[PDB]
């Protein structure tokens, strides 16, 4: 605590990665815990450089999309502070363990791609990197809250905290755990 930042109130201790596969691309607490998610603007100039930056920051980055929200990273952080707050009142946990489950449960195990034969569509099943899983899982759940709040009275904060619950405990009421299983259902067929 006096030598390692919390989050402004939320411990990064008592936080685990419960896979051996997806750690070393999920990290949040080795020394990478900080008061806020922000950077000086170094995040990528090498392929390995992407991995290092926190998961909580990565979530904030992929939250601002679709034209009108680009370049408004401070507005974005407002939504994240409410998210953890709502998650803690609503279920009562270290609200980061919610998020870590939500990411791990939404990442695909097998994926398909295209292959050109006879000028006609054929598909091939292939595997997926841990770095791919994390990138995909962060994409998918953020699309859910963006979609729901497009005509609902509910705010995006409320929608997003709901979306991490249904991902963290699979229940197929989320946009993520649905879309995960769609890909794998294809990957079984053409293989």
């Amino acid at each position: 605590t006096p030598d390692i930042k919390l989050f402004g109130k939320w411990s990064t201790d008592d936080v685990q990665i419960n896979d051996i596969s997806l750690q070393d691309y999920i990290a949040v607490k080795e020394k990478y815990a900080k008061y806020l998610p922000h950077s000086a603007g170094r995040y990528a100039a090498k392929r390995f450089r992407k991995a290092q930056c926190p998961i909580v920051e990565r979530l904030t980055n992929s939250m601002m999309m679709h034209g009108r929200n680009n370049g408004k990273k401070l507005m974005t952080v407002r939504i994240v502070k409410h998210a953890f707050e709502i998650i803690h009142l609503l279920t009562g946990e270290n609200p980061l363990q919610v998020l870590v489950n939500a990411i791990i449960n939404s990442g695909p195990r097998e994926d398909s791609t295209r292959i050109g034969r006879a000028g006609t569509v054929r598909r091939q099943a292939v595997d997926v990197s841990p770095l791919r899983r994390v990138n995909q899982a962060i994409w998918l759940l953020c699309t859910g809250a963006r979609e729901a709040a497009f005509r609902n009275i509910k705010t995006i904060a409320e929608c997003l905290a709901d979306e991490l619950i249904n991902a963290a405990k699979g229940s197929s009421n989320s946009y993520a755990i649905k879309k995960k299983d769609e890909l794998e259902r294809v990957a079984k067929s053409n293989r």
Binding site: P2, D3, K34, Y35, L36, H38, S39
Partner: protein, 141 residues
């Protein structure tokens, strides 16, 4: 005898000249408290060195800072970058090596441009685009 050493920080043309003058506590910026510098959501960030190093490093100085340039954001990184280096310079000049070498290891661990500066500034636009890379649409019919 009067002791006074000055430093600055920069990020994206936002200068922040933070003088460390002998005294006790009371860090300010523009003759205002740092507690009320105004986005007040990034309040944990400019406070970060002071909070992390403890307030007992800041017990032989009065620091005041003057700023100019940049936007609301880039100023925050400038004032942080200056106060970090200001503290260091005070130890570099009036106290021994092993005091400040310790302090250097702590800050540079979570380096975030506290003791260094980005070389990145805007690139110059050329014609045929509204941006430096982005181009106007091309039609064949």
């Amino acid at each position: 005898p009067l002791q006074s050493v000055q430093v600055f920080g920069r990020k994206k043309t936002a200068t922040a000249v933070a003088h460390c003058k002998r005294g006790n506590g009371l860090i300010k910026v523009n003759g205002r408290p740092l507690e009320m510098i105004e986005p007040r959501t990034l309040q944990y960030k400019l406070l970060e060195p002071v909070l992390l190093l403890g307030k007992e490093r800041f017990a032989g100085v009065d620091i005041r800072v003057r700023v100019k340039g940049g936007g609301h954001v880039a100023q925050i990184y400038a004032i942080r970058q200056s106060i970090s280096k200001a503290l260091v310079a005070y130890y570099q000049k009036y106290v021994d090596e092993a005091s400040k070498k310790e302090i250097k290891d702590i800050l540079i661990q979570y380096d975030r441009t506290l003791l260094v500066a980005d070389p990145r500034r805007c690139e110059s636009k050329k014609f045929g685009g509204p941006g430096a890379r982005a181009r106007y649409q091309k039609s064949y019919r």
